[PDB]
């Protein structure tokens, strides 16, 4: 792993809100820097601390604070947020104040979705859809296909699990989920991925097979009022046994 | 600074050779590479200064020059597609990254079988050389399989309104 850790994993909020972004640097180093990266921006340089100090500037808007605690790890505040400030953050750690002979490591980072309501969260829907007869018959495989659908945002990350085991092999998914209501701002988002398995081997019944979605969806820390359930971070998953 | 090609694409199992020019004065500035993988973070590479440098990563070559350099997968596959960054890095702004290079890799498909099939439809066996309001499509993604050493073209049609046109002689069953 990337040594540098990061909170929170997700993150939603109601535009104009204050969120405070924890990193724990490689321990072992002096300098934490924070990058931020939207689509129509790339990876952009934020700020670096050295030591407890304030070192490299960048482009923290005036909204943005920065700080390394006494023990390197660092915070980052992001004040009255922007549906423009829906990016994914990124801290990152180094040995020495300069990154030039000693390297940077970045974390995992956070995603930071900013939105106008948070009625606009949605769990997904997920189907599993068995292969059809025909590509038996032509192709002598089998091609399993699932649909996760209906979410917002698109913290969605889709797993393949056959006989109990988790397969990485054989799998296939989009890297951009499709958008449902291309025109609408805040539209639901819609994933397929494919496992294609031998044709003997699903027309085994003793396997079985379980396409996993997991969801970033909203804290147990928000108001929720809704009469439907609400959109938290959860696993929403379909199995599908071997038809003979 | 530097700069390097926006996009390339090279094959599955060959060396791939990520160029990158600096004939701005690269210094005591050390030539600096990081990637980006599909839905992921920035990871560091490889990272030289007057000599080619070796690690588990990657090679770099570097110009006698040094005016370019050159990022070398020793050996790419489909998890190698990534975003490559050039960067410079030598004393105490400047902690920044570029453009990059959209590295993308396409597997050997020996025998492409083009058919749509009824699953929702799925479209799938078909050649790199093809690529895709009311119906959702999917983007073409590739899967390759352990054991069988086959990897595999496909991509996905749904509607709610049926399977309708979504590609050379493909196969459409009663
Ligand atoms: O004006 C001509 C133009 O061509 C260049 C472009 O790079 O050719 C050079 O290419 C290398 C840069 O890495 C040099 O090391 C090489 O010696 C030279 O042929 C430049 O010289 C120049 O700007």
Redesign the pocket.
């Known amino acids: 792993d990337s040594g540098v850790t990061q909170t929170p994993k997700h993150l939603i909020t109601a535009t104009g809100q204050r969120v405070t972004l924890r990193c724990s640097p490689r321990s072992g180093d002096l300098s934490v820097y924070w990058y931020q990266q939207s689509l129509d921006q790339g990876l952009q340089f934020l700020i670096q601390y050295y030591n407890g100090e304030e070192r490299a500037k960048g482009n923290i808007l005036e909204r943005f604070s920065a700080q390394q605690f006494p023990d390197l790890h660092s915070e980052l505040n992001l004040s009255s947020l922007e549906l423009g400030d829906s990016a994914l953050y990124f801290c990152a750690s180094s040995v020495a104040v300069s990154a030039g002979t000693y390297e940077q490591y970045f974390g995992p980072g956070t995603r930071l979705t900013v939105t106008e309501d948070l009625k606009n969260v949605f769990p997904p829907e997920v189907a599993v859809f068995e292969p059809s007869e025909a590509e038996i018959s032509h192709t002598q495989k089998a091609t399993l296909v699932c649909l996760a659908t209906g979410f917002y945002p698109d913290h969605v990350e889709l797993s393949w699990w056959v006989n109990g085991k988790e397969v990485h092999s054989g799998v296939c998914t989009d890297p951009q989920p499709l958008k449902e209501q291309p025109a609408l701002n805040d539209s639901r988002y819609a994933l397929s991925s494919r496992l294609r398995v031998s044709a003997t081997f699903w027309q085994n019944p003793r396997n079985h097979f379980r396409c996993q979605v997991q969801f970033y969806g909203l804290s147990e820390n928000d108001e929720w009022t809704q009469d439907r359930a609400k959109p938290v971070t959860q696993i929403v998953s379909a199995e599908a046994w071997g038809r003979a | 600074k530097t700069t390097q090609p926006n996009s390339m694409e090279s094959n599955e199992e060959e060396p791939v050779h990520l160029p990158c ?1 600096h ?1 701005t004065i690269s210094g005591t500035d050390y030539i600096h590479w990081y990637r980006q993988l599909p839905s992921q973070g920035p990871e560091y590479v490889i990272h030289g200064l007057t000599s080619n440098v070796n690690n588990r990563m990657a090679s770099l070559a570097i ?1 006698e ?1 040094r ?2 350099s050159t990022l070398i997968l020793h050996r790419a596959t489909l998890r190698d597609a990534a975003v490559y960054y050039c960067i410079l890095r030598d004393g105490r702004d400047g902690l920044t990254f570029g453009k990059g290079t959209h590295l993308i890799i396409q597997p050997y498909i020996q025998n492409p079988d083009p058919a749509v099939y009824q699953l929702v439809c799925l479209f799938t066996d078909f050649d790199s050389q093809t690529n895709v309001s009311d119906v959702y499509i999917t983007d073409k993604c590739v899967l390759d399989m352990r054991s069988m050493d086959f990897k595999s073209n496909s991509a996905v049609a749904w509607s709610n309104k049926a399977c309708a046109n979504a590609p050379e002689d493909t196969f459409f069953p009663s």
């Open positions: 020019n004939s110009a020059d005016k370019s």
